[PDB]
């Protein structure tokens, strides 16, 4: 993984030694080249994962997440460079450094072969993310949002640390390859009930689980656009990725420990989809959409079947590109009208035609229109949940109805109707903004042609 | 104070601590503490104001009381063993008295009340010595007597110190009192792991001293002693706000920073002894420390507080303070995690 | 060797350089009272260093290349604007007074540093000890609020306690009507707007507070307008002063070393002039301060520590 | 209150530069930024990367498995063996408890 770690580090000297007018050009160009070379990770085998060294490995689960992570850094740079234009030059370089350092922790987190190394990097992402939100957010509430983000994560992470060290003491290793062969079943006891909870609660908070999701509407709304892009696209997937790995060592106790959390998710998604129908803030609406989608990922991981793991992996990738695109779409409006209120600016399809096409395409992927990989993932999860219990089709079906209503409600309210008369600064969409939109949607729609590379290890 | 007198008194502070650390005889250990107490009082009074007089008086009364309890423990130990060798004590009542005496000297809860007040009442330079160098002698004694220490007593002191240190810091706006309550909390981690692995006590002590020295040195550089005066630093030395942010995050124990290393290793040693409830409780309680560290970062680095017109006159002069070792200390305070296996040098 | 405890130990002690001619002389009086000319003559005849009264741009004269900076780097406080609109809504009156006190505090430290390090006395024109007369005059005319006065006193208490008063205080007593005529003849349009009640307040404070206070600790020479014209007769008065009172008699090498360590560290001297007390007159919003601070660093020879600015010809930076 | 700058006015990049691409105020940097985004984003990563993915060598050996299965089916049906047995492991190598 050094062929990605080292060049990712070299982005930092590149940004700091660039001419004052080339920091965005240079960093964007070279983060795209790193993104290109990440495709070499798709040398995957049917039986064996790609094991580079004692420290890092890649498999069909981590590979697509790595490719998404390295692709997002260029997109976060283009999204940021407009609202940071007036920023002091050295503070601009520091902002880029936080994004680069976040990428470095992410690509190592998704490939660390030992769970305690995963834990340290899993936790190291808090620092740059917290700094990005609190330093470069716009509102007063960004300070409170950082505190909620920090302590919701840590309240779950600290028990995980104790559990992992306990597992290493008793098993003798936390290397994930070793855990595949030395795993022993977990027999019922109050001691093991709390080992299970400590192994799963840190990842549930990151997803987030319904009930523990309050940090996300605050954090995903107060953050600058780049912060929201990474929070929705990747950082939420640390929870899903972590669960997918650690559930190996939790069987068969997951049989009955999953019930309270499946209930929170099945009912949670219907609750958080319904919330989106009455949201007045466009960014808040998108954030609550992420909770609804990640509820399916939680259920798919917990029921633990070959189809649900394929569906969970597809959903995580598809949601990352969609949710990131929606935040970017809403940001373009915000950079014009300086407000997140959804009803403020209406009938925008009349004033910004092409950008209304992106809104439509983003909305269709969100409501899981076939054969998008959003539908592929969402359908595979529904297939496996039906087998788990047929009655779940009722809750999945209702959520699919509600999701279409709020996806098209957001499209109709902002893009259709009559334009607001007094808003007269809707300038035509910039090339940067159009390209930023097409760099989400085009890769997302291309993956439909070859969906096997985003279905994970159980394909 | 004459410069030569100041140096001689500082060397006597160190000599007293060194006497404690090289002595095989309880009488010389007690002498070392007394010599150390003698030489630090003039450092507390060096500015001669009613608050420094109160601080020194409260320090002398607490330290001199603890020394009496320490000498009582040594004499009881002599009666029941007929020897003075510095090692495990041979009487459980002697072990209680010595442990309480050392907890008093360390300012561990519930013997903690003097630490916030004494630190607030003395200069920053004197507070730096009080909260770092002065922990070495009592810790070195605990390191040698721990086999005879009552497990319930030492873990009770450790738990109360983490709670009271964490809660106490929440209500503070003065920097010296924030450092004092932080020190109380960190003492709890040091003595919690002492019964299990004394090596981890030394690592926590060493890392704590580095981070504490780094913070006091940065406060001294700007001559800041309140939260609000520290909030002007962004409009004078922007680099210093970043170093303060990194150290404060480190002191909170966040990966991938150095300050996470002691908590990591202490949890490991405790879980190896089937101590699960206590390390979980300690780590969660330490989130109180992180909370009021984070508040400082908010008012110092992550936002820009209002400034004053006269501050513009400061732009035209460079920092003149020595800031000795600060570049090294801040790097060690933040960037040591990849070298954690180096802790074996302390074995 | 930069002065410090090591220099003290090796022999750099104040009592070695200080003679009978190492005095700190302050010249005071009302506006257009002839202080400047009298101060310059006294310095030249007694062979001391002369410090022209500290104004708005005093600090610029001691750092950088010694030339005035744009007015945004002094807070935009204007003495001319104080005369035109003493009751300005942007708090210029007090902001100017707070800026001037800090400039005097800095000048006093510079004067003390020169006196302690070389033994040559100095001559000042007003000082931190007499700056309050303007504040009292401003408050009695209603140019500033009682809160501005409270802020001024808080800053003074924690700053003036660290220094020693002048050896000699020279006061030139010019009555107000004569001053009004003198201001009128001078010609500058803005100063003509000073009202007599304002000048009477300066005089009342000078005689009602400053002089009784200084008398207990300094030698005070009170001259009229005519006596002050011949600087030679004033110098004769200073030369036969007994110097039997004040805190200077209690000073020793130990104490003057502590004083020297303070006055040579200007950031320590100015430490409390920016205490976090949020008066509107002196509080600057974060967005304004950030912008001005960036522009200050973009001035010639101000980005880096003095001697490391290559834009202005500094060499050997890679070895310095 | 206090001494604070007023909120600066909004800057429309099109007034100074009608041909603005939205990247930079400087027209020359603005053109270069658009060029690198399009060339490295669309021409390199998306076009060549899509071509790379399409020609991946038998990703996860699904094509070898189909070839192998055909070989097994042919051999087993010719020799009369069952196509697939219920037992994955030979029961002669297993020692049941009790």
């Amino acid at each position: 993984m050094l062929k990605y770690i080292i060049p990712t580090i070299m982005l930092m000297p590149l940004t700091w030694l660039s001419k004052n007018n080339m920091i965005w050009v240079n960093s964007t160009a070279h983060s795209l080249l790193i993104s290109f070379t990440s495709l070499l990770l798709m040398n995957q085998f049917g039986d064996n994962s790609l094991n580079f060294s004692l420290l890092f490995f890649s498999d069909s689960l981590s590979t697509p997440l790595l490719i998404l992570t390295m692709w997002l850094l260029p997109l976060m740079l283009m999204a940021s460079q407009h609202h940071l234009s007036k920023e002091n030059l050295t503070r601009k370089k520091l902002f880029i450094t936080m994004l680069i350092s976040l990428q470095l922790f992410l690509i190592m987190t998704f490939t660390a072969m030992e769970l305690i190394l995963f834990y340290i990097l899993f936790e190291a992402t808090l620092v740059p993310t917290l700094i990005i939100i609190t330093r470069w957010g716009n509102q007063t509430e960004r300070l409170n949002a950082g505190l909620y983000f920090l302590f919701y994560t840590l309240a779950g992470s600290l028990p995980l640390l104790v559990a992992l060290i306990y597992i290493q003491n008793t098993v003798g290793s936390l290397n994930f390859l070793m855990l595949q062969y030395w795993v022993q079943p977990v027999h019922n006891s109050w001691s093991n009930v709390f080992m299970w909870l400590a192994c799963m609660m840190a990842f549930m908070v990151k997803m987030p689980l319904y009930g523990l999701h309050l940090w996300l509407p605050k954090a995903h709304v107060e953050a600058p656009i780049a912060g929201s892009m990474v929070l929705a696209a990747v950082l939420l997937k640390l929870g899903g990725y972590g669960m997918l790995r650690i559930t190996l060592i939790l069987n068969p106790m997951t049989d009955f420990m999953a019930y309270p959390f499946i209930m929170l998710s099945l009912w949670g998604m219907i609750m958080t989809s319904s919330i989106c129908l009455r949201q007045t803030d466009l960014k808040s609406l998108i954030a609550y959409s992420s909770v609804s989608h990640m509820a399916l990922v939680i259920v798919a991981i917990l029921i633990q079947t070959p189809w649900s793991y394929m569906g969970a992996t597809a959903l995580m990738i598809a949601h990352g590109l969609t949710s990131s695109m929606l935040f970017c779409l809403a940001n373009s409006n915000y950079e014009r009208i300086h407000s997140r209120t959804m009803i403020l600016a209406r009938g925008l399809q009349t004033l910004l035609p092409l950008m209304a096409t992106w809104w439509l395409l983003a909305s269709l992927t969100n409501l899981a229109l076939p054969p998008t990989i959003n539908l592929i993932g969402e359908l595979f999860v529904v297939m496996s949940t039906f087998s788990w219990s047929n009655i779940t089709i009722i809750l999945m079906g209702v959520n699919m109805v509600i999701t279409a209503l709020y996806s098209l409600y957001m499209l109709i309210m902002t893009q259709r109707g009559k334009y607001t008369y007094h808003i007269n600064n809707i300038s035509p969409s910039f090339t940067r903004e159009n390209a930023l939109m097409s760099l989400h949607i085009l890769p997302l729609l291309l993956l439909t042609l070859n969906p096997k590379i985003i279905l994970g290890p159980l394909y | 104070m004459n410069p030569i007198i100041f140096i001689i008194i500082l060397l006597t502070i160190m000599l007293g601590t060194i006497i404690v650390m090289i002595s095989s005889h309880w009488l010389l250990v007690w002498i070392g503490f007394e010599m150390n107490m003698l030489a630090i009082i003039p450092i507390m009074m060096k500015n001669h104001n009613p608050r420094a007089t109160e601080a020194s008086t409260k320090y002398f009364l607490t330290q001199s009381t603890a020394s009496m309890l320490l000498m009582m423990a040594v004499i009881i130990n002599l009666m029941f063993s007929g020897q003075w060798t510095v090692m495990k004590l041979f009487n459980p009542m002697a072990s209680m008295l010595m442990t309480m005496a050392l907890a008093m000297k360390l300012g561990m809860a519930p013997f903690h009340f003097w630490v916030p007040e004494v630190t607030q009442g003395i200069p920053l330079s004197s507070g730096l010595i009080l909260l770092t160098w002065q922990k070495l002698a009592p810790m070195s004694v605990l390191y040698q007597i721990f086999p005879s220490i009552n497990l319930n007593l030492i873990l009770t002191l450790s738990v109360l110190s983490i709670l009271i240190g964490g809660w106490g810091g929440l209500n503070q706006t003065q920097l010296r009192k924030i450092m004092a309550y932080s020190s109380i909390a960190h003492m709890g981690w040091m003595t919690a792991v002492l019964p299990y692995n004394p090596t981890m006590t030394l690592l926590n002590l060493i890392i704590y001293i580095i981070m504490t020295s780094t913070m006091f040195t940065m406060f001294m550089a700007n001559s800041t002693t309140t939260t609000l005066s520290l909030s002007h630093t962004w409009n004078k030395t922007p680099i210093m706000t970043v170093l303060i942010l990194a150290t404060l995050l480190s002191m909170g124990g966040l990966p991938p920073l150095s300050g996470f290393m002691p908590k990591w290793m202490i949890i490991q040693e405790m879980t190896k002894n089937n101590s699960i409830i206590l390390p979980t409780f300690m780590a969660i309680t330490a989130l109180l420390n992180l909370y009021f560290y984070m508040r400082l970062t908010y008012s110092t680095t992550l936002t820009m507080f209002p400034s004053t017109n006269n501050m513009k006159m400061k732009w035209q002069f460079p920092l003149m303070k020595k800031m000795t070792f600060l570049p090294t200390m801040v790097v060690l305070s933040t960037m040591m995690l990849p070298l954690t296996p180096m802790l074996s040098v302390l074995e | 060797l930069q002065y410090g405890p090591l220099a003290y130990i090796l022999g750099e002690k104040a009592t070695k350089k200080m003679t009978e001619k190492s005095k700190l002389i302050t010249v005071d009086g009302n506006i257009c009272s002839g202080k400047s000319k009298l101060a310059k003559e006294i310095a030249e005849k007694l062979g001391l260093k002369h410090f022209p009264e500290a104004g708005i741009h005093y600090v610029d004269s001691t750092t950088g290349d010694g030339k005035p900076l744009p007015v945004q780097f002094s807070g935009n406080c204007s003495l001319e604007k104080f005369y035109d609109d003493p009751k300005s809504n942007d708090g210029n009156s007090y902001r100017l007074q707070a800026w001037l006190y800090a400039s005097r505090l800095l000048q006093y430290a510079d004067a003390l540093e020169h006196l302690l390090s070389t033994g040559q006395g100095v001559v000042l024109e007003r000082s931190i000890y007499s700056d309050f007369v303007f504040l009292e005059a401003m408050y009695r005319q209603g140019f500033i609020r009682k809160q501005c006065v409270d802020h001024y006193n808080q800053v003074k208490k924690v700053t003036i306690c660290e220094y020693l008063p002048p050896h000699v205080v020279v006061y030139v007593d010019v009555p107000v009507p004569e001053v009004q005529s003198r201001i009128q003849k001078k010609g500058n349009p803005h100063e003509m707007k000073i009202t007599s009640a304002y000048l009477q307040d300066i005089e009342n404070a000078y005689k009602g507070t400053f002089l009784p206070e200084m008398s207990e600790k300094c030698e005070v020479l009170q001259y009229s307008a005519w006596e002050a014209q011949d600087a030679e007769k004033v110098v004769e008065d200073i030369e036969y002063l007994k110097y039997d009172k004040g805190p200077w008699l209690d000073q020793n090498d130990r104490k003057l070393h502590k004083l020297r360590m303070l006055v040579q560290d200007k950031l320590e001297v100015l430490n409390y002039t920016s205490i976090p007390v949020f008066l509107p007159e002196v509080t600057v919003g974060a967005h304004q301060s950030d912008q001005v601070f960036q522009e200050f660093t973009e001035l010639p020879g101000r980005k880096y520590r003095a001697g490391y600015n290559e834009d202005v010809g500094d060499k050997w930076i890679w070895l310095k | 209150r206090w001494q604070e700058d007023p909120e600066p006015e909004d800057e429309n990049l099109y007034e100074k530069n009608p041909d603005s691409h939205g990247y930079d105020k400087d027209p020359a940097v603005d053109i270069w930024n658009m060029r690198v985004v399009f060339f490295f984003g669309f021409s390199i990563v998306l076009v060549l990367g899509s071509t790379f993915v399409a020609y991946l060598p038998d990703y996860r050996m699904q094509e070898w498995a189909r070839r192998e299965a055909e070989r097994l089916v042919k051999y087993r049906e010719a020799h009369g063996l069952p196509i697939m047995e219920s037992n994955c492991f030979d029961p002669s190598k297993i020692q049941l408890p009790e």
């Binding site: 470069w136 716009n138 | 008012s299 209002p306 | 949020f278 919003g285 967005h287 | 206090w2």
Partner: peptide, 19 residues
């Protein structure tokens, strides 16, 4: 608008004897 930064009211939360 522009990024919010603490104003005097916010800053005085941290200027008292206690929090």
């Amino acid at each position: 608008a522009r990024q919010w930064q603490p104003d005097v009211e916010w800053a005085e939360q941290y200027g008292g004897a206690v929090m």
